Symmetry: C2
Subunit: 174 residues, 2 copies
C-alpha cells in the first residue's frame, strides 16, 4: 500500500503544502483506516520524508549517481552533467520540484554534496554554503519549469545553455 498513500501525500502537498499533510487526511484521501497508514509511516514527518524520497530518488538513477562519483571526471564537467539531469528531469516532471521545493521550504553516499565540496576545495565554485549552490540550481530550474507549465512562454523559448549560464555564473569562482 506504499504507493497509494505516497501519491496522496503528493497531491496534498501540491494543493495544501507539506504543512497540510497528516495521517488523518492521508487516510481520508485514499479511503482506509488511520492505522492502515501507521504500518508504513507512523507520523507526519515520515510521510513527507517518504514522498520526499520518492521524488528525490527519481532525479538521478543509481547509474547517474555512480557516474557522478567518478573522481577522474573533472568537477566542472560533473557539475554540468548533474544540473543537466536535474533540468531534464524537472521539465519531464513539472510537479516534482514543486513537491521537493515545497518540502525543503517546510524543512546517501553523499555523492552530490561531496562533488560540490570537492569543487569548492578546488576553487572551481565559490566558497559559499553548499545549500546556496544547491539552492540556485533547484530554484532556477523550478521557476523555469513552473513558468513553462503556466504558459508564460514556450518550452522551446530557452535552451539548457541559456538557463545554465545563469546557474553556472552563480556558482563559479569569480
Amino acid at each position: 500500500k506504499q504507493v497509494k498513500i505516497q501519491d496522496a501525500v503528493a497531491a496534498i502537498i501540491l494543493a495544501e503544502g507539506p504543512a497540510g499533510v497528516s495521517t488523518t487526511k492521508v487516510a481520508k484521501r485514499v479511503g482506509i483506516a488511520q492505522s492502515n497508514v501507521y504500518l508504513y509511516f507512523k507520523n507526519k514527518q515520515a510521510l513527507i520524508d517518504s514522498v520526499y524520497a520518492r521524488e528525490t530518488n527519481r532525479i538521478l538513477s543509481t547509474t547517474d549517481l555512480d557516474r557522478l562519483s567518478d573522481s577522474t571526471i573533472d568537477v566542472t564537467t560533473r557539475i554540468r552533467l548533474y544540473v543537466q539531469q536535474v533540468y531534464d528531469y524537472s521539465l519531464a516532471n513539472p510537479d516534482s520540484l514543486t513537491i521537493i521545493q515545497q518540502i525543503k521550504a517546510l524543512n546517501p553516499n553523499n555523492i552530490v554534496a561531496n562533488l560540490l565540496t570537492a569543487a569548492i576545495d578546488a576553487k572551481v565554485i565559490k566558497q559559499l554554503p553548499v545549500s546556496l549552490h544547491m539552492g540556485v540550481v533547484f530554484s532556477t530550474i523550478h521557476t523555469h519549469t513552473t513558468n513553462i507549465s503556466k504558459g508564460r512562454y514556450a518550452q522551446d523559448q530557452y535552451t539548457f545553455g541559456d538557463i545554465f549560464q545563469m546557474i553556472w555564473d552563480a556558482m563559479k569562482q569569480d
Copy 2:
C-alpha cells in the same frame, strides 16, 4: 492593536500548517477573542491570508526605497544593487517573512509594488544588456531564493549571521543576473 494580533495569529498558523490551515475560528482561538470580533476586521479566511500577504510584501521596500529604484537618472547597476541589498537586510531582520510570502504564493499559483517599479528596473536592465536576456521571474527568483536560503540557514543554526557579508552573497546573485 486587534488587527495586528489577528495578522500575527494568521502568520503563525501559516508557518505551522500552511495557508490551508487558516480559519476564522482558529485565528480567534489564538488571539483569545470571539469570531464575531474577527469578522469586524476580515470577512473570511481569504481576507485573513490576503492581509498577511500584503503586510509581508509591503515591509520589503519603503517609499524612499521605491523612489530611488524608479529614478531613471540613476544607472541600473547601482539601483539593482540597492534593491538586492534592501531585500537582504529586510529578510535577515524578518527571518520568517519570505517563508510566509512563499507559502501564500505557492497556494494561490496565478513587482515594484503598485507601479511595477522593480519589474520596470529589471526590464530596463535587460534592454540595456546589463543583465541576462532571461525572464524577469528568473532574475527575481535568484534574488529571493538565495536570500531566503541564507536566512533560513541562519535560523537553523547552520552558521552565524556575520559568517558571510552582503558582498559574499551578492557576488553569487549578481553573477547569476549580469550579462555574460
